[PDB]
Homo-oligomer: A and B are copies of this chain.
Amino acid sequence: CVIFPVEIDVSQTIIRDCQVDKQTRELVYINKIMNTQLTKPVLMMFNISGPIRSVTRKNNNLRDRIKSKVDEQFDQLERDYSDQMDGFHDSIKYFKDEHYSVSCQNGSVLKSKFAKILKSHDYTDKKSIEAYEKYCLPKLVDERNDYYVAVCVLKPGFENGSNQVLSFEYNPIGNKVIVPFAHEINDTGLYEYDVVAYVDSVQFDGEQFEEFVQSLILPSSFKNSEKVLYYNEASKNKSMIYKALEFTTESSWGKSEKYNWKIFCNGFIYDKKSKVLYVKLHNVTSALNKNVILNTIKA
């Protein structure tokens, strides 16, 4: 998530983190990188709540199943009265998934090991090393280094249109899980997000979710009267904290019987019964650049 070199353009990040057993959890992390030049590797790093133990291999369809599952929780919040975008389109699966090379650093040793790490990847100039320490290191360590760091390397020859993927099991320190939403720092202070996540065996944190959702800026539909609404709702077994873009259009089938659109819902949907968290931050921007940190279920 904290990506280096800092130029690098990414989108469509998909994440899944599930309890494997009482002391193991698995992180599946998928994204799509846009650069073609790149002669050196992409070093993507991010915080996790415990040491990595082994990498896993998932089936070729997991990616779309994660995304489909997240989307079907949010669709339920929307009211999209348009069937235009229609006719699925002739794009075909063709590019094979690329795999990041994974290693792990205890948060406590990263500051003393980072330059060594860049060097093993042929990044030796002062320019690159200072960029990393200025824009990346800070999103990976804080004087209270109790969390770990996943170091993901992407060899440079990868094919543009590929999904870059990785998955591994780790051992959470103290019933914590870190969903790696944070990005490397940038000069403007505004960050763009485009990610969905599925995380199970987790406790609800209404306040952390409110803070994240209130900070979100949604995409505009460019209609005259659009308004952004903020929701902090609870149904039978779900808690929903999100924003939605809403507006009105006159009835084509009735007279003054208007249509109340409710689209681009982004936020957090928590299933109180399954203990599952669904997150969607699709094309939204925010000044908050942080991970979501939760407590796992205890027994």
Residues of A within 8 A of B (CB): 53-54, 56-57, 59-61, 64-65, 68-69, 72, 75-76, 78-88, 90, 92-96, 159, 169, 254-255, 257, 259, 261
Q: What residues of B have a CB within 8 angstroms of the CB of A86 in the complex?
A: 94-96, 159
Asked if A64 and B76 sit within 8 Å, CB to CB, the answer is: yes
In the bound complex, how far is the Cα of B159 from the Cα of A83, in angstroms?
A: 16
Q: What residues of B have a CB within 8 angstroms of the CB of A59 in the complex?
A: 78-81, 259, 261
Asked if B68 and A96 sit within 8 Å, CB to CB, the answer is: no
Q: Least Cβ distance of A54 to chain B in Å?
A: 4
In the bound complex, how far is the Cα of B83 from the Cα of A59, in angstroms?
A: 10
Q: What residues of B have a CB within 8 angstroms of the CB of A261 in the complex?
A: 59
Q: What residues of B have a CB within 8 angstroms of the CB of A85 in the complex?
A: 96
Asked if B81 and A96 sit within 8 Å, CB to CB, the answer is: no
Identify which of A61, A69, A82 gathers the most chain B CB atoms within 10 Å of its CB.
A61
Q: Least Cβ distance of A244 to chain B in Å?
A: 13
Asked if A88 and B72 sit within 8 Å, CB to CB, the answer is: yes
Q: Least Cβ distance of A11 to chain B in Å?
A: 21
In the bound complex, how far is the Cα of B26 from the Cα of A257, in angstroms?
A: 12
Asked if B90 and A61 sit within 8 Å, CB to CB, the answer is: no
Q: Least Cβ distance of A82 to chain B in Å?
A: 7
Q: Of the candidates B56, B87, B94, B254, which one forms a contact with A54 in the assembled complex, judged by CB atoms under 8 Å apart?
A: B254
Q: What residues of B have a CB within 8 angstroms of the CB of A56 in the complex?
A: 257
In the complex, residue of chain B having the shortest beta-carbon distance to the beta carbon of A169: B255
Q: What residues of B have a CB within 8 angstroms of the CB of A88 in the complex?
A: 69, 72
The 9 A-B residue pairs whose C-beta atoms are closest, nearest first, are: A59-B79, A54-B255, A87-B94, A60-B80, A59-B81, A68-B92, A86-B96, A59-B80, A85-B96
Q: A54-B255, A254-B54 are known contacts. Are A61 and B87 too (CB-CB below 8 A)?
A: no
Q: Least Cβ distance of A261 to chain B in Å?
A: 8
Q: Least Cβ distance of A103 to chain B in Å?
A: 16
Q: What residues of B have a CB within 8 angstroms of the CB of A76 in the complex?
A: 61, 64
In the complex, residue of chain B having the shortest beta-carbon distance to the beta carbon of A73: B88
Asked if A68 and B80 sit within 8 Å, CB to CB, the answer is: no
Identify which of A59, A69, A159 gathers the most chain B CB atoms within 10 Å of its CB.
A59
Asked if A81 and B57 sit within 8 Å, CB to CB, the answer is: yes
Could you pull out 6 A-B pairs where Cβ atoms are within 8 angstroms?
A: A57-B81, A59-B80, A61-B78, A61-B79, A61-B80, A84-B96
Q: A60-B82, A81-B59, A85-B96 are known contacts. Are A68 and B90 too (CB-CB below 8 A)?
A: yes
